[PDB]
Structure formats: structure tokens, C-alpha cells
Amino acid sequence: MEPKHIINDNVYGTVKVPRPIDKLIDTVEFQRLRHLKQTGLVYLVYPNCEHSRFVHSLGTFSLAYALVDKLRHSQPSLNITESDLICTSVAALLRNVGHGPFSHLFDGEFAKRNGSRFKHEDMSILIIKKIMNKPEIKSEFACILGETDEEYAKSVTLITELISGKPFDFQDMDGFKDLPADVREETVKNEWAIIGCGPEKSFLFDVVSNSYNGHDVDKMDYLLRDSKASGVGITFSESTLERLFNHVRVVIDPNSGLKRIAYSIKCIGDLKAIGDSRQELHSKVYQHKAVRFMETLMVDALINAGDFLKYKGSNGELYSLKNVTEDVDAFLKTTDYVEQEILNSQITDPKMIEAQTALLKIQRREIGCKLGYFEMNPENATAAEVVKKVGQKMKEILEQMDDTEEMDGKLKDIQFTVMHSVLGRGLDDKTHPIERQIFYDGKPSQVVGFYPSEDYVINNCPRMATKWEIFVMGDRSLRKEPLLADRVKRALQLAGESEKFLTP
Amino acid sequence: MEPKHIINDNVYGTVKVPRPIDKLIDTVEFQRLRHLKQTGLVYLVYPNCEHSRFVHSLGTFSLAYALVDKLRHSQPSLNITESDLICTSVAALLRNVGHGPFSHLFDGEFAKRNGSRFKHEDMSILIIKKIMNKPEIKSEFACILGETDEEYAKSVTLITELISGKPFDFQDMDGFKDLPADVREETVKNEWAIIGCGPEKSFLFDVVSNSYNGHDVDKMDYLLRDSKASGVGITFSESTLERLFNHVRVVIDPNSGLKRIAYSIKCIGDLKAIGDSRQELHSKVYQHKAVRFMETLMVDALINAGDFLKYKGSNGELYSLKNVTEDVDAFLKTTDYVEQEILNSQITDPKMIEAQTALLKIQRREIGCKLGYFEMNPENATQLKGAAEVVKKVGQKMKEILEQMDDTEEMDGKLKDIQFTVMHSVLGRGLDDKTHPIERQIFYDGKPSVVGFYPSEDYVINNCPRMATKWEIFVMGDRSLRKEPLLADRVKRALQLAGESEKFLTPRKRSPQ
Amino acid sequence: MEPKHIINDNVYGTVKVPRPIDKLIDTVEFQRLRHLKQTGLVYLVYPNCEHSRFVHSLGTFSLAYALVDKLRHSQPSLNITESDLICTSVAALLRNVGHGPFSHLFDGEFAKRNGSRFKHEDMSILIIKKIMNKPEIKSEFACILGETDEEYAKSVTLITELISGKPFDFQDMDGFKDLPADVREETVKNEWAIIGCGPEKSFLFDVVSNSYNGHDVDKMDYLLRDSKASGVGITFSESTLERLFNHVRVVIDPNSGLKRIAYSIKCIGDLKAIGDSRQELHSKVYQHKAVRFMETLMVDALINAGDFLKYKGSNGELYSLKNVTEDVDAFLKTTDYVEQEILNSQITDPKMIEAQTALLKIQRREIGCKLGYFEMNPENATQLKGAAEVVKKVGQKMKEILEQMDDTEEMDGKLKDIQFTVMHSVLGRGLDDKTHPIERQIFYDGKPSVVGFYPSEDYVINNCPRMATKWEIFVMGDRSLRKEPLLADRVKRALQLAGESEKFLTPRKRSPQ
């Protein structure tokens, strides 16, 4: 009943670690997360954002354990077992165990240019299977998760499904909502493809990786943690989180008949704050335009250095940074110290020298300069095509400016790149996550929940849940030529208006 | 050079008080503000909201002084004088000196039922004139505000105008915006009705009481202070405020030619957070439904007790609580103490006993039972392109629905006999139902060391809901309904059906889309 | 299982109110605590210290409930019952229900000059008996505290004893601890004078009002709350409190054999922070020298107004402020609004006019001028191994020194004519002048799943000063001395010379050693 450890945490005060979760924390696979920054290169703009994936993972664990333990005590008819509490807890603890260095770059532009095979969710699942089948881990968890191969393997399957599964996405297939009760009961019964548990435990899928509306404990932890680290204020607070946890129940989904996590309708504004806070932290922190400029230098360095950096894998074979996802043991040797590996390399191949040049430009702040931005409604597109169209129209406009003002190709020779940021609440361009959250009325002590009225987002939210930012990165030389820089900024705005993305 | 006092403050750490602002703080008129709760009856739901008008006024002073002092150092060409800095600072310090007890009730339902003459802004102006003409204050301020009676009087006029004036409201009238630029200048030249300063100091009107967009330092202080006291998180933070103060300049308004306070365009999101935070604190804190129920009991007590409670005015005449606004001296004897004056009264007139009964209901938590609520778009109040009409129609439709429920379920009038009242709250961002304050804030581009712009029409479409205001409609019934949930649930069902049946709301859903 | 209310609190985030504690909160007697400032007149120096006794009492309740509920889950062999948990919780909630207005002045100088009979702990016990015997409260608590009159009466007796009892003070008497342990057990057996529970529940007496070492939840709450409201940093933090709650057990006292609350020995520094934080907040906040100056004006006003202010008691008899402690009903009409009652009085008796004059001096900041201070070891009060004697000797020596200064510098009696008063403050850790509270706290070793120990004599020697208490001696003169710094500086010099010349202090130095 006493925790093995109580660990100081700056968001919650402390995190309690019960036996045998301590055995998962004290593995090389979990301790690796101390050497991955939660927010990647954001620290080059917000220097206090140097918090690790380790502290996020402990925080996320603490929330998943607290929420399932609260549900078990307030609704004994759910039949939540010690096994359900530990599986859901472990999924929360290990959801993030498979990030590479600078994960969003590693899985994004680096993976795209390199044809990389696996992304962090795939690697998480591989590392979870590796950790849970270690004999010194199985001997500690067997009394909770099962002594038989069948029982233990089902428990491990549930842990990986709580991360990877999307068991409610069928409910949004066209006309599922208008089907008769009969058809519906049968469809839900035969749609159930989860192996680790039956439909009677469907609500656990809302806790760890909530694909339906993004209201998972991972989200709640990183909003609070990343707000505190960045100093950017958000409406979702520690007190907001405690309000949700004091007003949470499992109810029947009126659309599927499955058990779902619901909140008291008096908390709808508190749930809306989760999506609004996500979009705010994306706009101000994670996709800050100077962070984006430095990401382009880091991706070039990783691509140029990638063949030369080698990691020993399972069978003593060496894997390059470009192939490390092909072997879990080699992958586990990678950290954010990849940056220092490049800087300290004694390899004199021209490509290594190019990678070192790019990293040294970051440290001297020799980065691209801002040549304008606008925000736009994703609907006015019908994002890569928008970027290509804006870049082509800007080039035409700069040619016309160059010839009309007789600048002898000074404008036509300017090097610039058009980039985009998706600034959303999660989910799709058009849907606020709050619209897809179930609520209950009254103070229950079986309850059927409801989704909000169509009026709620009309009265409280902008028409679209997502905006795109289109921005221009120029050669740093343009910093000393404001008259040229001003023409590129003018061209971006005219290209936006000429495509009907912006009104003048 | 050095402040006379440095006073601890929980929002900023400290407030610096330079000479001779200390002399205004140390007056009976300013010290009275210790005994007025900034958020009225909110403390009966949020018990930590017991902060005074005194701490808000010191905070608001500190921001006005910091902002004008920053502008004077950053933009010497503005010709900001010590007299402009002190007048703007004092207007910020004293803007709230004229509140009555439980101000929003005092100036709202109490004033309406009583036909009260003056509201807090009127009383502030009267008390400002009284403070600044005290011999012991004039002797301290004459060296800054003017050694001639005429000069001193002009400074006092400026202080009161920074609170009461609306010098930019002409810019929105007629089609002033479409007028030939030259005629615009002539109109602006002849519209200038401010006596205490010329149009070259127009930007000072943005600092204290900003009628054009509500972005004054009074608003910035209360959002931070009321958020911290309530525990309700908002996007406008102390760091947001410091960002605005590090990115503020005076620029020319492209629509009037007048000097205005502007912010860097990189801070547009930080400015939008002011209006969004105001609406959030109204929805969650100031117009909390249980606060509104207890306000109805407090107003009944004040109306019933009002004739019996007397305050000595100028020349020793007694004024009732219902007439105190007619004499500044009698008004200055009023505080939130009025609640204890009623409770402790030895008057046995039936009306005093009714006031005591109502206050004892608050203390025993004998308050109305919640019988449902909904939010609505103000536009849905009519079918053409009336909050009171919404309230009357909802109440009439609920009565009809409860009659049908009563007869269909054979409840022998137990539903039809339920007493309930329908109320509304206006939950807005500070201006009109349709306009986000951010649309009416001027910004600048680049890192200047001159002409501002208003946001594109796209900004509100991409970032804000269609309407800046929402209405909440809610039902209060007899407290006894707490012990009869089956009956209470029918009334809550009737409110939802009534909203839908009058086209005020569309229903809660069985699927997202 | 579910709380009736969850109430926002700025120290803990929230306080959970289980049924039927909500019924005690919603009484006129508990709601009165909204209108008593927790730190009295401190707000005239620290304007954010306007938090009420109501918020402190809810916080204190929340800690007592959490601690006893944690002990019941961690140590089922203690046989903690629902009745023990609710009695201890209620004692914590209501310990502070009996404070008067400006309690420390009311029970201190006002009571001394007036010969007042009862102090706040006496009134708390009277008000607790009144609340728990209300028919609408007994109907809610009878199912937990007892369905027979005898059982209910025993529960109410336990609630009052957890506040007033001192069951461990015998352990320090005589040479009790050198006694043969057999005789010790029989003495402890026959010393047990508590009626509401047996000695098997002795550990509950450490929770609410801890006379033995002051480590009660009331102390833990006010240190956190008063630190946050004042902005004065202390070592005892919210995280320190959670550390104690995660490392707390009931063990056997090795000196008495009674069950006592103990902490893990790894938390000894966290416990020492409680007494050190108390002394710091006394020195910096509660006994701030400008607060003490304004207290002298407030006590004079209360004494002068006291006969004229009347409160209706049981059977409709009127009690003056000087007699209100003689009738619980009359006492319950008093709040901090007594200050406004004086200010607004229409009585023209010269004594009422004197009270109004004193309160107007506070509002205009017409307070005494500081004319020096020093700190001293209480041991230096006599030459053998008398705060009043220190104060008399300092004042007499200063007078002689000022006479010599006046004649030597030919100031024609301008120094000799200065009016001043010498005062003292006791700045201690809560027990006696010589004992650090931590020395009297039991600890345990290891991670048990039984006999505690007191700290080694080395702990205090290595970590604490020799004395747990210091005295501050300070001088208050006429406010006019603010405008005559050359005279003021001579008086400050005289205080330092007077302290040195009486061997109360050694002088400020020209080199560290």
C-alpha cells in the first residue's frame, strides 16, 4: 500500500511509484528518456524548455494510475481489476519509450528524405514487448498480469493496444449514427477487434492514447508541463485537471452502447480548454518560426551525417543513424547527444564537414531571416500544394517587381523557402475535440451520456478548429537589405490575396 | 528619485509609491476601499475572492505609472510632462474611489428598484474633486499640477476626463471613415471637447478608462488579480502583461490622425486574450449561478432595510442608504459593513425583519435550487435580423410543458405547483454583441526607433467565434426541490424542451456529427 | 463516498467537504468568520493579508480530516472509528470559531485594560456546544456521534477536549521520567482525565491543538497561508507538508507508553522548519513595528468606544463591547466592522470623539515615528541566572542620555522635550524561551509495516541558536520627528547607548572579528 518511491515533480509536487512499476523505471530503456528533450529544438527559443521525456512519462503514468484507481473506487460495477489498473498505468508510462532523437524531425523531414521504415509509435510497441518479456520483469509482473503465457501475452497485447488501437473510429463511418438499435448492437459486437480485453473495458481506451477526441492523460500532462516550462499561460491549469478528475465517470455512449469516460456537463469549458491550449502552445511554442528555421539546419546535418554515425545492434552488427529503426538494440543507443557526435566526429568526408557547418551555424545564430507570414483557413485550399502555389506565385510577382522597378535581377536572385505550420486542436481541420466528448448531467450515484449541442462550438469556438500559418525563410544576407526584404513580404501578401486565402 | 514606500502585492511582488502619491493613499476616501470587496458576493462561492478595491486600485496605479514612464523614455517626441505622468497615474489610482457597497448590486438591481440618481463613475469624479482640493493635498501637488488656481483646476479637470471622457467614439459615427481625408482632419480638429489637455496627448485616454476597445490598465490588473484570487486559469498572465509593456508605442491612428497606444503585431494573440479572459471570468466567476441566486437575497435585504439605515452628510443631515448618492460625505460612510448593520439592527419594523430574514437565508445556504440552464446566441432572441422576452417566453413554455407532464403522469398538480424564476446573464468581451475588442485595437509593424493598422477581417474569422457575446438562461426554484430529484429532473427537462420549442437552442446529441 | 462540496482554496487548490460537515459550515456562527481577518491589523502594512478566519478554518479542517483518514488506512490496529475521524475534523474546523474582532488586541491589551473574563479558547468551547446541540445539526450528526443523549454528549465533550485538553503536560512534571517504569504506567493510568475518549486514542490530541510541541494542523495551515498572503518566504512549504503526511505514523512514547503522532527521522529538518517559520513570520509580519504602532491607536479607540457600542444578547438584554464575552449571543454579533461602528457613531460624548480621532489617525497615517530598535537575548534582562523592567530601564537611561546631549550641544531643551514610549515584542518558536519545539517531537526509524524517540541533544546544538526566543525593544515618538531628522538621529543613538549601558546589547562593529 505504501509507494516504493515518492519522486519530486514540478507540476504535481510528487509522483508516487508503487511496486512493481519501479522495476520498469529502473531499466536502460526507460532511463534513456532522460536524454531526449520533450520539445526537441524549442529550447533554442525558450531555454527553460529542456525538460526530458522521462519527466513527462512519470507524470503521464501518475495521471493514468490516479484516474483508473478513482474510477475503480467510485464505480465498483465496472469490475476494474488490478490487471486493468497496471496495464493502463504501464501503457501510460511507456507510450513515449520509442522516440528517436529530436523525434518530430526524426519521424518527419529526416524520415521522408531517408525513406525511414518505423515511427515512434511502432518503436514504442517493439520496446514494450522487449521490456515486458525480460525474465526479471516477467518475474515481478506475473502475479498481477498472469503466470500463464496466454494470460501474460494477453496483458502485454492490452498494453500495446491501449497505445496503437482505434476501437471507436468505426462509429464515424457514414450513416452508422442513423442505423436501427438492432443493426447497431450487432455491428459494434462484430467490429470489436481488440484482443487484450473485451468491450466491457472499452473505456480504458480513452485514458492513454485517445484517438477519438485527444482527451488522454498524455495530453493533460504535456499541456501543464510545457506551459510551465515555456512560461506561456494557458486556460488548462493543474486546478482544471483536478476539477475533471473530481467529475469523471464511465457512462454508456448513446451512439454505440460502449462504456466511455465522460465528464460532468458543468466541466464542458474545462474540456474545451484542452484543445484551445494545444493550439496556443503549437502557435507560440512548438512551431515558433525561429525554431522552424533551426530545425531546417538540424535536418540537413542529420541527413549529411547519417551514413557515418553507427550504433551496435542485437547481433554485434553496426547500424547507421539512417537504418537504426531496423534494430531495437541499435535504436536504444540513440539520444539527443547525436548533435555532439556530429560536432566531435574526426571523419573528414565532405558530407560530415557539411553537417558540422550546419550545427555551427545554429550555435552562432547564423539562421534564416523572417520574410513574412499569414494565417489562413484550411478550407480555402480545396497544405503542400498551397506551399507550392504560394512559392510559384511569389516568384512570378518578384519577377514583375524586378522588371517594373529595374533592379537587374536583384529580386529574382533572392533565395527563399515557403513553409507551413498546421495550428490545430487535434483531429480534423473542421471539428473541435469538445464536440466529440461525451458528458453526463446531474450527480449520479446506468447513466447514458450525451454529446454537446451543435450550438456549443457556434457560441464558443471559431468556425474552423485548425488554421495554417504560411511563412517565408530567406537567406540571412537579406537581414542587411530591408528594401529587398520588404518586397518579398509584399509578394507573400499579394500571393495570398491573388489565391483568395487572404482579404486586403 | 527613490519611492516613498514599496508595498507588497501578490500579483506584481511590489508596488512602488513615489511622492506625493502617498498623500492620496493616506486619505479616508482611499482607505475606505479596504472595506469594499472587488468582486462583491463572489466570495460566497470562491472564498479566497475577498480581495479589496484598495489592492486593485494600487495595482492599477502601478501599471499606469509604469506604462506612461516607459512611453516618455522610449518616445521623447511625445513631450510627456511630469504633470501628464502624475495626472494619468492619479486617474488610474482613483478611478474606483466612488463604488458603493456590493457595487454591481448597488448600481444595478438596487438602483433600478430605488430610482437611484448616481452610479460609481459619477461619485468617483465628485470624490476626485474633493480629494485634490483638500488643503493638505493641494500643498503637496501644487508644485507638479500648478501653482495658480487656474493651472491646478485644469490638472484636476484632466484627471476626471481621463475617467469620464470618450474622445474617440466620434470616429465610428456616420460614415466618418469614408470622408475625404482633409474634411476628416477638420472634423477631428473641431470634435476635440477635452479641456484638461490638447489632442497631442490623446493617447493618455487609452491608459485609464479605454471606452474604444477596453484595453486599459484597470482591465489588465483585475484579470490577473481576479484569476489568482478565484483559482480560475486564463490565457492573460503576468508574463503576457510584461510582453505588452515591452512592445508598446504611441502611433498615428490611420482613421483619425490622433495619437493612440499600439502594440507590436507579434502581440495580437496576447491582446485577444484580454477579451477572451474577461468573458471566461464572467462565465465561471462573476456570474456564477449560485452567486446570482444569493445576489437576489442581498438586493431584497438592501431594498427592505434601505429607508432605516442612515448616514450623516455635509451639515449634519442624515441620508438613508436609498439617498446616500445625493451627498458625497454620507456616501463615504458606506461599506460592505452595511450587511452587518442590517443583521445587528434593533429596528423591529416588519421590513427590517424581512431584510434580516433574507440575509440569514444566505448564511444558512437556504438558496434557490438550480432547475436547468442553457447558453444561447443573442441573435436567436427574435426571428427577424430582447433578453426579457426570452426570459418571459421560456417561463411560459415551461409552465405549459409542466401542465402536460403533470396530467400525462397523473402527479395531482405536484409539477404545476412548482414555483420557479427564469433569469439571464450577459457573458461578453466588453464591447457590443458582435465586436471582438481585438478588432478595434491598433498595432504596428517592425521594430521602429509611425502609422498603425487595425487587424485584417480574417483575424476574427480565423481566431474568434462569430459573436463576441453569449447569454446564459437559467432557472431558480424553491430550495425544497433539492429533496425531490424526480420533480427537479422534470423541470430541467422542461427548460431544455422550452428552449428548443422557442428556437433559442438546438438539442444535446446522440453522436458528434 | 463523494464530497458534498469541493471549495477552491489558494493553498491546497481545493478543500473537500463531506456530509455532514457542510451543515456546520452553513451556520451563522461559522459564516461570521468571513468578517474576522486572520492576521488582524497586519493588512495596514501587508495589504494582501486580508484573508479571513473562515478560509483558515476550512484549511485546518481539510488537514485534520486528511491526516486521521491516512492514519486509519495505514494503521488499522489503531481502531480509528468514523466517530473519531468526525470529532477530530470538527474540533479542527471549529477551534477558531470563538475569536473576537481584532482577536490579539481584543484578548490582549483591550482585555487587560478592561478586566475581560473570557478569551477566544473559552468562547470557542461555548460556541461548539451551542452549534452541536442545534436541533438541525444534531439530526445530521446523531448517526455518527451517537443516537443516545449520553453518546452524543460524550462526542461533543471529545470535540471540546481536543481543543482545551493538555493530556501530556504531566510527562514533564516532577522527575516523572526518572520514575520506575511500573509506577510510570500506573501514574499515566491514573493521570488520564479526558472524558471523551480513552488513552488508546491519545494520539488525536497531537492533531488539533498540540500543547506539547505546537505541531498541530492549525499551525501548518496558518504558516502556509500567512506566508502566501504576506509574500514573506519561509522554509515550510506545501511540499514540506505533503512530505510530513507521507511519513507520519502513530507510535508508543518511550517516556509515557502513550500513543503519539511521529514522523520519519528523515523529516527532522522539515519539522524544525515549523518553529523557525513561526518566529520568522512573527518578526517580519505579525509584530512588524508599524503594525504595533497602529495597534496602540486601535486599542485606545476600542477602550474609549467600548461602553457606547451595544449588542443584543439572549433574552434581548444589550451588552457593551466591554462585556460581550459574558453572553455568547451578544458576542456573535461582533466582527471587524466594530471599526466602522465607531467611525459612523452619532454619539457626541467626548470619549466617542476620542475613539474617532484615534481611528482617523490610522487612516491618515498619523502614526508614531520609529526612534530606534535592538534585539536581545531574554537571559540578559537580569544579571542573575522582566521585559517590563528592560522597557523601564531603557526609557530612563535614554532620558538621562538625551539631557546630557541637550546641555552639551546647547539645544535649549529641544532634545529633553521629545515624547517617546519604549515597547517590546516577544519573537519565539511557540514553547518556552529555552526549548526548540523539534526537541519535543517524537520520530521513528526505518520503514515500519513501533517505539519512537526524541532527537539527540546534539541536534539543537548543531542546528539551532542557544535560545528559541528573542526580544525586540523599540521606540515610538511623536510623528513630528519625521520632519526633524537631526533630533530623531540623537534619540536613535540614545537607544543604542542605553542598551549597551544596561548590558542588554553589545555594539555594532567596525570589523567582522
Next chain:
Amino acid sequence: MEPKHIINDNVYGTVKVPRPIDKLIDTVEFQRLRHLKQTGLVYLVYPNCEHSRFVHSLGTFSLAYALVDKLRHSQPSLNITESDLICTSVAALLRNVGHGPFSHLFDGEFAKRNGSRFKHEDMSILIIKKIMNKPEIKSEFACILGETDEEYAKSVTLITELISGKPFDFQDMDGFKDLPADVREETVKNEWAIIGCGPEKSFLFDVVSNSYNGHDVDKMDYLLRDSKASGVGITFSESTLERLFNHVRVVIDPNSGLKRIAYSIKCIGDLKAIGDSRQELHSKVYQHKAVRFMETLMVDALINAGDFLKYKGSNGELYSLKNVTEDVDAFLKTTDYVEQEILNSQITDPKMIEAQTALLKIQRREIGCKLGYFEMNPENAAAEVVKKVGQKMKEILEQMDDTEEMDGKLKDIQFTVMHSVLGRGLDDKTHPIERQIFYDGKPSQVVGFYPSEDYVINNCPRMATKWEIFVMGDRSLRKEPLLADRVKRALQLAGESEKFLTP
């Protein structure tokens, strides 16, 4: 007039960066500080203590600039120049630029076992001379710090002296205090060995590296920053810091006649909080006993791996981790990623495999176990105390082993005795507050004073320093409580038998 950058900071909200301080921040030498943890291995106990030397250095800069700028505005008669403000600012920014990886281990046990040449203060001074003599830095600072070689070199000398100099230590030579005014004025005049400024600017030496009483802006920043990161509450708060900055003046030292930073006497409690907060964070955070256990594993790994890890220096020569302090360019390639260099090494030499074994024990939490501790007054004597306690414990365990017939089960137990110095700074006996000058009243030349001898008697324990003596055992004893209990009993009996502890 406007800062070039305003950078978010979790302690102050923001740090303003004026031109041309931005040019020093945007160097590889300063950016390296992002990859050195301020608190070393503390994060293995307090996982939120992962803040870098970079954020501490920016904070320390911001305080030094604010304090000297405030003094310049409040006391124009000090003749503080733009050059004094920028030299003092830069010394504060760069004081910490020369730490190695896991600095306290690197300069402590690693250096002792390796005979390492230089410590971090020496390397700071080398790196400051390298940065300030870069042509693209000199071209930016020449207009403030001097266009002539002589002027520029004087300014660079002042920056390095504000870090290394101890110009007031002569004031504590026996009998200096009792000398006549004549002798004193002459002694102070001829003791002045600072080259970068004259004695009229002595007060600047109190700002950056305060060797007299430790009341420098470096100390004030790390107490606030490390308290916030650790979640360990202290009496020194951000509001305490603002109180000091609102009540600070330069006054004449009554003992030397030199100008010194002084605080209003109403702030004596607020100054005492600095030393008390330092001792608290040492006891609870920096010298946490589990941190110490993991330090012994990390030192062994660094010693075993040190010959194999190589860094390219100035002339393309390779320097081992054990020699990197011999070449500033090789030193600048070192970071906390040395831990990952060991873990990922393909070298199969037995010593490299031993280093990897030790680091993998840290990650699996296979660390020594606690076998007791006590606190002691240093006057009852630290290396000798550790050796005596270990020898007496060994004798006591032999007597226990034979008397209880345990056939050498006690005598075979492997354990190590360690010590921690838990102090307020300075010496075992002196509270820093006793050595701080204060002033009286509200001045607008003032002579300051030191506190009465009574102040520490009434407010502080008799000694300013305590020692903690503790035992680390083989992790096997975690499963042998009866054996572990005898070692704990032996430590206590050894303390009592040497009169360090009383019954």
C-alpha cells in the same frame, strides 16, 4: 536603448539582452553550457533538476547588469562608467564558462585520482581571454571596452579579476583592525594589487564572485533557480532578492576605507537567508546521500574510460579526457554527453568494459545501500575523522563478530565511510551575515557597519558548518537487515567513542 532580445526565464519571467552581450551568448563557447547540467548527478534523485549552466549564466548576467545599473542611477558620485557596467556584466555572464562535465566530480575525485592540472575557475579565465580577443568580438566591444590594446587589455583584465581576485582578504590579517588610521590608509593603498581598476571601483568585487562573504549575484541566482527546480523551499525568495536590490548602496567600509556594497540594516534577516538557504540546499539536494552513491559509480567510469576518450585540440592533436584541461580547444568539446560516449564505445579493453558496467549499474539502480549517518560539529576534530571512524567501526565489527559468533559474516562486510561539508560558505565558525556591511537610515558619504556579535548569538547556531558522516555498503546488505543494523550500530558507537556524538 531597446534590448536586442528578451528571453523567457522561469525565475524572473524574462532576461533582457542588450547589444553587444548577444554576441557573447551566440558563441560556441557559451552555447556549450546548454549541455552541462547546473547540478550534475542531482537529477538522478530530483528529476526536474535538469536545468543547464546556460540558464544560470543568463540569470546571473541579468542580476549583475540590474544591480550596477541601479547603483549608477542612485549614486552618480560613484562615477560608474559604461565600461564598468559591461565588464561587471560580462564577468557575471562568463564566470561559469569553464566547467567540465559533471564539474564537481571532474574537479574533485576525478582530478585528485588523475593529478588534473586546472579547475573550472582557471579554465573560465582561459576561455574569457579566448572569447574577448576573437576579432568579431573585439570589433563589437571596442567602442565600450577600449579601441587601444592597452585599454582593451585592461578591460579584459578587470573581467578576469572580478572572477579570480580576492582584494579584501588582507582586511582579516591579525591586528589589521586595531591599526591606527595612518598605518591603515597606507596599508590599503599599497595592498591594492588589482590591475583592471583603481580602488575607487572596489565595490564591483562584491557583485560577481564575492570571496569576502559570498553575497554575489551568482549565489542569489542559483539559490532561487535550484530551489525552484528541486521543489525544496528556502527562505530566500524572488521577493527577498527585490527587497535587497531596492535597499542597496555603496558605502565606506569602516575597517579599510574602501567602497563596498551595503544593504539597509532592515534587510539583515534577508541577507542571513542567503547562507541559511545555501546550507539547506547542500543538505537536502546537492549532497543527498543517494546522489553521493551514484557519484562514486560515475567517478570510477570516468577514471576507467578516461585514457580512451579523445578530443581534438588546437593543433589537431588528440587529448584524452584525463588531459583535456591542457588545451582549451579540446576542453570545449567536452559535455555531459561523456556518459553516452562511454555507453556507446566499441572499445573492448577490459577498463572500458568496467566503465560501461558502472554506468549500467546507475541506470538499473544497482547502487550501494545506506548503513547509517550522523551529523557533527567540525570543532570536535574531515579526511582524518573519516579514517578514524572507519578504523574504529572495523574494530567494533570484529568485537561484534566474535562476541555473537558470526564466523566473520560481519568482518567480511564491505563498506566505505564518507563525509559531506554542510556549510553557509566561508569557514566552519563564521556566518556570512557577520561579514556583510549594512547602513542605517535612508541616505540621499555614508560609513557602514558590521552587525553586533549578538546578531549570530540570537539568530544562528554556534557553528556555521556541520559535517555529515555516512556509510555506503555493498547493495547485497539490502537483503541482510540484521547485518546492516550492526554496521549502523557500529557507526553510532564509533561517533560516541570519539566524542563526536553524546549518548
